Amino acid sequence: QVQLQESGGGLVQPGGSLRLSCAASGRTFSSYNMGWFRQAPGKGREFVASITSSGDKSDYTDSVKGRFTISRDNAKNTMYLQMNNLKPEDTATYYCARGGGSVWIWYEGGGTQVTVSSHHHHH
Numbered sequence: 001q002v003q004l005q006e007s008g009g010g011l012v013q014p015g016g017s018l019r020l021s022c023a024a025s026g027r028t029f030s031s032y033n034m035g036w037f038r039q040a041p042g043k044g045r046e047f048v049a050s051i052t053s054s055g056d057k058s059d060y061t062d063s064v065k066g067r068f069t070i071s072r073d074n075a076k077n078t079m080y081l082q083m084n085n086l087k088p089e090d091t092a093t094y095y096c097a098r099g100g101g102s103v104w105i106w107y108e109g110g111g112t113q114v115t116v117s118s119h120h121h122h123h
Contacts, residue, residue: 004022004023004106007023008020014118032053032100035048035099037094038095041091041092048081051070092114093113096109
């Protein structure tokens with residue numbers, strides 16, 4: 001079974017940054033379009049960003065355009081999501097998926113949790 005394992009989630013204040021990673025098994029990682037998706041409280045899974053096999057083209061959902069950057073390192077079988085200027089509405093579990101013929105396939109991986117919260121400062 002193919003593994004698309006997510007990491008990098010955590011808790012940040014609004015305006016903070018997090019970098020997520022999606023690490024794939026196998027030897028043909030570079031041949032597929034790849035994408036990030038997220039599931040916010042009470043909602044379904046929704047598109048965040050996608051990138052072509054070669055990395056030459058990317059697409060973003062409107063609400064993250066300009067703040068998030070998708071990238072990949074094919075030599076390391078890894079895709080990244082650099083999330084800057086984070087907002088509470090970005091709180092969700094984030095999942096990566098591999099693109100096929102008109103479908104995004106999840107494969108194995110439990111997602112990574114991202115919490116963006118304006119809370120009291122503890123210092």
